[PDB]
DNA sequence: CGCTCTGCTCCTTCTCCCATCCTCTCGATATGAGATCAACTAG
RNA sequence: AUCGAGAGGA
DNA sequence: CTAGTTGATCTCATATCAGGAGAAGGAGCAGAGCG
């Protein structure tokens, strides 16, 4: 689930790259003549300011020029009909599948929603099953660096992938950290207990 | 996003080297963030309260600054490294009741003094006076 | 699809057979049966690549099977043995149309007669 | 037996379509000089 | 006013 | 007749992934049929 953080990070990465590009162009058109340049005039703060403002104001997550390409419906206007409406709106989840599709599978209530997503709250119209709401005690992780975990695993009896020979993989336990196969272990039970 | 993602994005950006001979570096190193504020035409730095942003149709945003180092090398590897501190690069809309909102850690009495509802949960932005919520 | 693959497979097959077959078919002339042959229609060439001598050997096996059946059941007449064996061989030739199938049918008949003899 | 004439299936392209009606909010989206002509505007 | 978007109603 | 005034009009000049379905074309092979 991409919350406000990652979405704004995507937008800001794009905007900062554009800002650097504009600074590059402005500096080039000055250094082509030998004369120095003032980076104060090379920085278009409007780039970041207006990009973030536009994306939050219209809900089109992307550049204003590629509005047709951008996904819409992000950044909706907060509902204030009643307090429960506001609370529900602040805990809303969206599947970008596309309401036009007629396959029932993505709209079905999967078993794994237990305790994570409310099984009752969902719009009854064209978006049934695609717009969801968090269960009361559900939480979404913000992420953390795996470096301490990798250091501990190395300190433990885990063997790096380059060192071990391929013959030792068969009976050992592969260890994945954030999808990276980082080594193997011979005593998975004790390792799980320790972790 | 404010604590880590912005700085990580800025640092991950490759420095730009330009050729016309003289060469430039233009490296960004660290970022600063102020609290939401409004400047009138006189330039007095007043704090923008969320209710004022709602009523005057303002954007509740904070200015973002970054330190920039510029170096120039022409001949004989002479280093002209110069630094521009607190360079303004844009404004970041601030989510209400977050760590960097003016309402952070205010008592119910303080919130009512600001014409804010204590029961208001926050978690949204004010863009041109309009309350905006990001859908996961 | 499957029809396209069936024709392509056939194209792959015939050329391999040609590679595995002689430029010209060394036709081994059909051996004419001896006048003492007790095989009905011994001069027929209905079943390709089948020799009269093979039919004689099969009839000999049938004779042995019939002898076993007789000695187990104590059959009285002997001329019936030869006539019955010849009739069985002729029936097998009339039914089958390929050498291997003919031999398999004859062996099946031999097994049937052996089982009947075992039964008594 | 070379060469042509279909013709047969098959893969590729491409173009079309995807209920009705209704409410609301919200964001974005020059100027004059000279020439020509024609109507006067009178002599 | 136009366009688009979104949220809704039956 | 016959020159002078009055308006309109044109030119020119000045900077700086979780569609699908069907119909039309072309492709390559396969064979038939006749010189």
UniProtKB/Swiss-Prot annotation, chain C:
Q: What does this protein do?
A: DNA helicase that plays an important role in DNA replication, transcription and repair. Probably unwinds DNA in a 3'-5' direction. Binds to the RNA polymerase II subunit POLR2A during transcription elongation and suppresses transcription-associated genomic instability. Also associates with POLR1A and enforces the stability of ribosomal DNA arrays. Plays an important role in mitotic chromosome separation after cross-over events and cell cycle progress.
| Outcome when changing residue 13 to A | Abolishes interaction with POLR2A
Tissue spec: Ubiquitous.
Region ranges (Plays an important role in affinity and substrate choice in DNA binding): 1-114
Q: What is the effect of changing residue 21 to E?
A: Abolishes interaction with POLR2A
Q: Which gene encodes it?
A: RECQL5
Q: Where is this region: Interaction with POLR2A?
A: 1-120
The domain-related comment in the record is:
The alpha-helix immediately C-terminal to the Zn(2+)-binding site (residues 438-453, characterized in C-terminally truncated contructs) is required for helicase activity, is positively charged, and may play a role in DNA-binding and choice of substrates.
* The protein's name: ATP-dependent DNA helicase Q5
The UniProt similarity line reads:
Belongs to the helicase family. RecQ subfamily.
Subunit relationships: Monomer. Interacts with TOP2A, TOP3A and TOP3B. Isoform beta interacts with RNA polymerase II subunit POLR2A. Identified in a complex with the RNA polymerase II core bound to DNA. Interacts (via C-terminus) with POLR1A. Isoform beta interacts with RAD51. Interacts with WRN; this interaction stimulates WRN helicase activity on DNA fork duplexes. Interacts with MUS1; this interaction promotes MUS81-dependent mitotic DNA synthesis.
